[PDB]
Amino acid sequence: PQHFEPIPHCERVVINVSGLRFETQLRTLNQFPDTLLGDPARRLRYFDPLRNEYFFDRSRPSFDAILYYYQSGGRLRRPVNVPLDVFSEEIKFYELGDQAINKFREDE
Amino acid sequence: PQHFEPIPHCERVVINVSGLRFETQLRTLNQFPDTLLGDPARRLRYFDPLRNEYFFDRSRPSFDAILYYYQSGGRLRRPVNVPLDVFSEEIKFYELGDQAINKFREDE
Amino acid sequence: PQHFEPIPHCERVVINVSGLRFETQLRTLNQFPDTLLGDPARRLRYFDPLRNEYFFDRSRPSFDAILYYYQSGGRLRRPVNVPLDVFSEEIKFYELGDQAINKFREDE
């Protein structure tokens, strides 16, 4: 029931979820290897080479919880502003991990 | 009960809903012909020629659901932060389609 | 139970509520004379002469409803993300009008 959250001081990345910009350090994304955002191989497709940011044309009220999963170091909880289906599709897209997906489902 | 969401790679448009900026690809808006945002004829009035963006002086907490309708490929659901009257007026303004309007009403 | 919302085409003003920027036309603000935002006399104090915007160091989740009152042409309603006390203090500060204040109180 306890998780670790990254402390500041290195490299900061900007994630643009359909106009909503999110800024986090790379160490936040590197906490969880695998996943769409964890490794550069599965996030090079969504990286815009000109704006120096990651663009996702998806629901913006969900990346608040998706980002907090990396920040909180494992706390995945759906905010009560979006349906369960929408968040399930979002977490399936971001590939948070089979164990994490099952844990979230059992928490719902 | 299933819908299709656009995949990334072309042209991206900025929609400014009373200060809240939304960025989506043109393919997201072109999923639904007709509608205010689907075709250029009904959205040239709201396009600002100088800022290169679409300005709508309306309720900003509703275009989250309006935009997701294009992103989710047909999923129109009202977020629980605005009343049914406000969202009904918004969807009537954006002209989401008589079938879509009736489907949303029967879902409420 | 019916209200009128301004149509687009003149001058647009930016209202910065503690970092959250809101853009509306003057016709939206001029719908209600009196009030803090309706007349230039009661909003010159909060106007930043350098950034060409109005700054209010107040709760940002309330100006969504405060702004919609001008947009919707008289529809004042508290969103369910802030308490009644906070919204009452906000509407008292913005001076929405004694009749409007009483109408909102009787609607709560």
Add this chain to the structure above:
Amino acid sequence: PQHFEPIPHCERVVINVSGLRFETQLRTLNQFPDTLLGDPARRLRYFDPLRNEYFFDRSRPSFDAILYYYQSGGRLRRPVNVPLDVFSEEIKFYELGDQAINKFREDE
């Protein structure tokens, strides 16, 4: 049951909570000495010297209440969009004060 909120006119600071920018006057932060944001000693670590802003890689839906605590002059209350578990860790990080933390818990 009454609190004082700062009036405008001096120095304004920008707080970037994981991409979400908050702007407040320094007098808002100086209302409460001690705390992470009250004194420069405990906020120099989180100040970005290049962007001239304070960066916190934490949950952005929680700093609305943390900022309002300084604005409202002592009104600390968790918005109903984030869990009590998440907010308790947030207020502990910002070190709102031993009396204030216990007051919030007794209010929950």
